[model samples]
Target: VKLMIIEGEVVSGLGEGRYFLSLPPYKEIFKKILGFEPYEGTLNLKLDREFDINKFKYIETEDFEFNGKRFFGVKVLPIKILIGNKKIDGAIVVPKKTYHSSEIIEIIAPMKLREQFNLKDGDVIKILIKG
Candidate 1:
């Protein structure tokens, strides 16, 4: 497998990831597939170019409804991230309905990424994808 490096900047979203990840159903599915109970939120990243989702293999969650709102299945891509001198395992989550553009990606990890890395908006990070 070859490594694909993507550079992105931290950006804040409308707290949608936090809400979705906190749901019991979502958490269960994530843990079953990702092998970890994900933190209650996601780290938003803004990339310079659009990510080609079709080129990568991903795990998709089952579609379900909550609070009278229907949600589509999400795509999860396991990835490795580098912040400064630290390395962490994480996944890129792509929801069926998103407020973000194609260049924006949401990441989930076992811990709070923002707090662990002390990251803030505009902070640049690198994601390593094995293909």
Candidate 2:
């Protein structure tokens, strides 16, 4: 299968990724699926153009509740990322409840991406959604 690729520029996030990634249910499921404990934070990216993702498969996540409100489960597609000559595994998360725009994507990986890769906002990156 050919890899479905997307190009985007890195951006800053609201810093909520750590809290969500730290959830016990998500950690268990992520470890099982991604084969590693996810880093506490996510790498945020902004696509250059809108791309249709309805063709990709989605993985369901655990439903959760907080502050007397029930948060529904999310759906994500596993993806591989490329930065310079480096490669890393990540996921494209679609939350059941979110305030993010369609252009923004949150990627979760096993390493501290920003520090490990010396990435900063506006850096270009490529993501392989499927192969």
Candidate 3:
């Protein structure tokens, strides 16, 4: 019954919330991947005390100059994640100089570690995500 593959890091659900506003096709795709449909109003992430914000993975944008003014175009911060108990230690790869534009500051994590431990890219492992 499996059709497509689920890519990206497996992460813990977010907000400790028990409900999602609405997910249509995403729900179908998720159900197809999960084998069971996520129950309506089922938004619990099933988390535990072993959670560390560092475990979550994030993708950030490099600095860029716009209109001669310095501004961070956008930063992608991973709000939540689920990577077992393995800690994700990383640093933003930014330039020493703080300029409006010119440097690429990105958040990096050990993708290799996830593979080594057979951890989901961003999925929870030992630690549970819940409200």
Candidate 4:
């Protein structure tokens, strides 16, 4: 995969981070695949330029059920994040069912990114991912 950098403004998600991140299937698999337990939330970024993720191959997890709701496994791409001069490890997540476009990117990391960086909505940041 070729390296690509995207610029965006940090934004809030639909408050679904905790619900999804706390799932045993996602929590356990993320720890195994990402090398650490992710913070129980996501950092949303609204991109400034068009980006296509379809060119890169996706990583998949096993399908699992939660609270009687059948959720198909997700496809993700591990990525590295940069906010100004600070660099952190992160990943791009895409659920089996998605309502998002390429302009919106959901990121996950080992720490509460907003608190770590003291970020608020509309804060600008950079993300480095495979293309």
Candidate 5:
């Protein structure tokens, strides 16, 4: 199933600083669980965007309409906070552009805009989407 993604109100990106790679402790755990090195086989992750694959830890399905044809697809697969290399945290980050080739838009809806903006939930937690 294919559904388009649109960057939501609060979008995020790699940090402003030049980022470097650091191994999370559970990388080995992933190798044990998933039976692969999560990239770094013969090529570096830099060579392959979305080292993770076509699956998500928490994806919900929804409906779609393309050329008057109906299709069932995944809605939200929030790449949420990481809990020490939890499988839910995708292994890589694919920007909202080229990676979303199947569709025109790739939504990056920020779940906690209030926290991002230093506001309280009851104080108006807006859903922030980022591109």
Candidate 6:
């Protein structure tokens, strides 16, 4: 296994992440797998180039249904996020059914990353994906 360094620009996303992360099932699973309850929102990033996400080790969630609607499973890749000299533990989330392109990456953390890093759309950050 190897380390992958990805640089991406922050981008705005539809508010769906806020809704999904707030679901009881998702929250419970995330806490068990990540050891912390994730913030209710995700930080969207637009990568400069597309890479095969399958190359990284990730944990997969089981398909679940909420409010009579079926939700697809997702892949969660633990990662270290860096902005300048600041760093934090985070994860990249890949939904089985997504509205995003291959170049878009959605990240989640224990706290709201945008507020923690004072990030705005277009601010670039570094992601360290471990083996």
How do all models score by TM-score?
0.90, 0.85, 0.22, 0.88, 0.22, 0.91
Which digits, one per residue and each the tens of the lDDT, describe model 1 over residues 1-131? 78898999999999999898999888987898889999989899999987766568888776898888877888888998888777788999897555544888889999998887799899999998877
Model 4 root-mean-square deviation? 1.9
Best model per TM-score: 6
Candidate 3 per-residue lDDT over residues 24-128, each given as its tens digit: 433343343334443333112222332232333423444455457553322222212234444443222222233343212222233333345564533433322
* lDDT tens digits by residue: candidate 5, 1-131: 43322222222324311121113322333344334333321101121123233443433334445557653333333432222232122222233223443311122222222233343212311211222
Judge candidate 6 against the unseen true structure and give its global Cα lDDT, from 0 to 1: 0.85
Sort the predicted structures by TM-score, highest score first: 6, 1, 4, 2, 3, 5
TM-score between model 6 and native: 0.91
lDDT of 4 by residue, 1-131 (tens): 57887788998878887788988889887888889899988888898754455666668776788889887787777888998787799888877555545777788999998888899999988888777
The TM-score of candidate 2 is 0.85
Of 4 and 5, the candidate ahead on lDDT is 4
Candidate of highest lDDT: 1
Cα distance off (Å), candidate 2, residue 67: 8.7
* lDDT, residue 29, model 1: 77
Task: Give all candidate RMSDs, comma-separated.
Answer: 2.1, 2.5, 15.7, 1.9, 17.0, 1.9
Question: Candidate 2: how many backbone clashes?
Answer: 0
With a 3 Å backbone cut-off (N, CA, C), the pairs that clash in candidate 4 are: none
Off by over 4 Å in 3: 1-72, 76-82, 91-107, 120-131
Worst 10 residues of 3 by lDDT: 1-10
lDDT of 6 by residue, 2-104 (tens): 8877899999988888988999888887888888899998898999887566778888887998889888788888888988876788888888655544888
Q: Give the TM-score of candidate 3.
A: 0.22
TM-score of model 1 relative to the true fold? 0.90
* TM-score preference between candidates 2 and 6, better one: 6
